[PDB]
Scaffold this active site. Sequence first.
Site, short mmCIF file in Angstrom:
data_model
loop_
_atom_site.label_atom_id
_atom_site.label_comp_id
_atom_site.label_asym_id
_atom_site.label_seq_id
_atom_site.Cartn_x
_atom_site.Cartn_y
_atom_site.Cartn_z
N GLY A 29 0.84 -1.19 0.00
CA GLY A 29 0.00 0.00 0.00
C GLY A 29 0.87 1.24 0.00
O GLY A 29 2.00 1.19 0.49
N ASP A 30 0.37 2.33 -0.56
CA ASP A 30 1.13 3.57 -0.60
C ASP A 30 0.27 4.81 -0.38
O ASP A 30 -0.94 4.78 -0.57
CB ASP A 30 1.86 3.72 -1.94
CG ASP A 30 3.12 2.88 -2.02
OD1 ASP A 30 4.19 3.39 -1.60
OD2 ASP A 30 3.05 1.73 -2.49
N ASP A 31 0.94 5.88 0.04
CA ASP A 31 0.29 7.16 0.27
C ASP A 31 0.35 7.92 -1.05
O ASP A 31 1.11 7.56 -1.95
CB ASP A 31 1.04 7.94 1.35
CG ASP A 31 0.54 7.63 2.75
OD1 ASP A 31 0.29 6.44 3.06
OD2 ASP A 31 0.42 8.57 3.56
N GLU A 65 12.35 1.87 -9.45
CA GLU A 65 12.33 2.16 -8.02
C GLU A 65 13.74 1.99 -7.48
O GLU A 65 14.33 0.91 -7.58
CB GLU A 65 11.38 1.21 -7.29
CG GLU A 65 11.44 1.32 -5.78
CD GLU A 65 11.13 2.72 -5.29
OE1 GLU A 65 10.09 3.28 -5.70
OE2 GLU A 65 11.92 3.27 -4.50
N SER A 79 9.17 -3.40 -0.33
CA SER A 79 8.55 -4.27 0.66
C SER A 79 7.13 -4.56 0.18
O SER A 79 6.41 -3.64 -0.21
CB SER A 79 8.51 -3.61 2.04
OG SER A 79 9.81 -3.50 2.60
N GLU A 139 5.75 -10.48 4.95
CA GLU A 139 6.56 -9.61 4.11
C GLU A 139 7.47 -10.35 3.14
O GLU A 139 8.21 -11.26 3.51
CB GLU A 139 7.42 -8.65 4.95
CG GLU A 139 8.32 -7.77 4.08
CD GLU A 139 8.88 -6.56 4.80
OE1 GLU A 139 8.61 -6.39 6.01
OE2 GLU A 139 9.60 -5.78 4.15
#
Length: 211
Positions: free
Chosen positions: A89-91, A129, A134, A174
């Site tokens: 997930g990301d902001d 990237e 992760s 993870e």
Amino acid sequence: AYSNTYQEFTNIDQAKAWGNAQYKKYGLSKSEKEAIVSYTKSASEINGKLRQNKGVINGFPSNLIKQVELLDKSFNKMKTPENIMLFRGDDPAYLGTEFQNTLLNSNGTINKTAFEKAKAKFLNKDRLEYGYISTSLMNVSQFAGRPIITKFKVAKGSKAGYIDPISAFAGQLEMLLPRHSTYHIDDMRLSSDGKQIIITATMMGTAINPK
């Protein structure tokens, strides 16, 4: 059709058993495990430095250089035996500082205009990237609070390590991916529940291949 099939774990108990099984065969050295533990304790800082310096580590403090090179090489022992779907997930910042304060509306849903800008910017393009990536074998609770969910399609044989059991601070299930990796964004759509961005991408590989 002519598309490949990627497995998706839907049972946490088996995902853990599967990951544990791969881990048991890595044969990681003590120093490689310590490097991974260290990464889990300072991930934000390490990836931040990697992005800042575009993957060049010569200027990092000597101890960090050693840690990074150990982690980089540890992937020679960690590969996935299956085509698998990995989640993270990301902001808003993930899409660029320009979206940090423009992606969401005052209610939780995500502005469609900003979303359309996100597509033109990333859809059908390769993305590099600099930091390590992760991910989790499943869409774990650690997410579901983030506006962006990415689903990476990782092919059999790809460098990927189940570190959940190596560190008390690793995320649930993870799976760590190597730094300096490139992936292609194949699809971008809103979640069907109240807006959210679901990104599907094909992991292409890393440029970091020591030996």
